[PDB]
A paper describes a structure:
Mer behaves as a proto-oncogene, having roles in cellular transformation of NIH/3T3 and B-lymphocytes cells. To characterize the active site and regulatory mechanisms of Mer and advance rational approaches toward the development of chemical probes, crystal structures of its kinase domain with nucleotide ligands ADP and ANP and the inhibitor compound-52 (C52) were determined. These structures had good electron density for most residues and revealed the canonical protein kinase fold: β-stranded amino-terminal and α-helical carboxy-terminal lobes.
C52 bound co-planar with ATP of the Mer–ATP complex, occupying the adenine and sugar pockets and having good shape-complimentarity to this region of the pocket; its isoproply group fills the space formed between Ala617, Lys619, Met730, Asp741, and Leu671 and its ethanolamine moiety binds in the groove formed between Leu593 and Val601. The hydroxyl group of C52 hydrogen-bonds to the carboxylate of Asp678 and the carbonyl oxygen of Arg727. Complementary, van der Waals interactions also form between the chloro-phenyl ring of C52 and backbone atoms of the hinge region (residues 674–676). For example, the distance between the tertiary carbon atom of Val601 and the sulfur atom of Met730 is 1.0 Å less in the C52 complex structure. Retaining its DFG-Asp-in and αC-Glu-out conformation, C52 draws the entire N-lobe, including αC, towards the hinge region (674–676), causing relocation of the aliphatic DFGL-Leu744. As a potential site for the development of inhibitor specificity, the N9 isopropyl group of C52 points towards Ile650, which is one of the few positions of the nucleotide binding pocket that is divergent among the Axl members (Axl, Mer, and Sky).
Author numbering: 575 to 622, 629 to 661, 667 to 745, 763 to 863
Amino acid sequence: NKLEDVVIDRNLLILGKILGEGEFGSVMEGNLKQEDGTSLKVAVKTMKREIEEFLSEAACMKDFSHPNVIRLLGVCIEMSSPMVILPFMKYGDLHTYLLYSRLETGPKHIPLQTLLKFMVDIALGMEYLSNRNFLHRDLAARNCMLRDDMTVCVADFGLSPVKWIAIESLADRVYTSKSDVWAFGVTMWEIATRGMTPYPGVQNHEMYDYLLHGHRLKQPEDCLDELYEIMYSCWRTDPLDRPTFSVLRLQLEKLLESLPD
Ligand SMILES: CC(C)n1cnc2/c(=N/c3cccc(Cl)c3)nc(NCCO)[nH]c21
């Protein structure tokens, strides 16, 4: 009964062209009409019956307030005869941006300093979420968006991927914010490599055993050992040994300082 204001009136909302389709749902561009009278550019995620439970998640998420975490604006429901509403991000997802940057006509070559900023942002977003005791469960560069001012924020959290999952979750189904810390390490690598799929040579079905024998992602070509140490700490076998997001965040910030201007 309480979280019912999270719901937005379907006619306040107008949908446009499709921006992508995964097996789950489809993401669309649209316009949301506001209190102002003004309209705001939004992105609309669709998915597919004990449903109340889902609504509470959106209610929770709506409470999130951090510049490095996306703000869910509300939800719509077209009656089964459910769509989440998020601010539109014109620069798109971080993964596709890294790839574009390796091409002419696309964004200039991202220098090291900017690659670190990217990671700091995500570290910060995850710091905040880890404090709220919120478990992400799908962190990857494809799920990090670029703001109009080139800030990175975290998106797609939860909503009900093998190469991003930590050993213990792969094995026992267990998942804690340390498992997210594992995903973050993989994400960092994605950025260091400017969009390589993790574990080249290793097929998905081999992943668990490849990790079980203590094998990790390899160090990228011209990567500082410091940066590599940091990402590697994210994948220590015991979750307890892995650093926390606030421990990580500060390491990246101090490293960024260490680099020339
Ligand atoms: C659902 C949330 C996270 N969201 C918010 N904005 C976007 C988004 N924006 C853009 C921006 C530039 C080009 C395109 Cl195709 C989509 N794209 C996507 N996805 C399309 C490519 O990954 N998702 C977006």
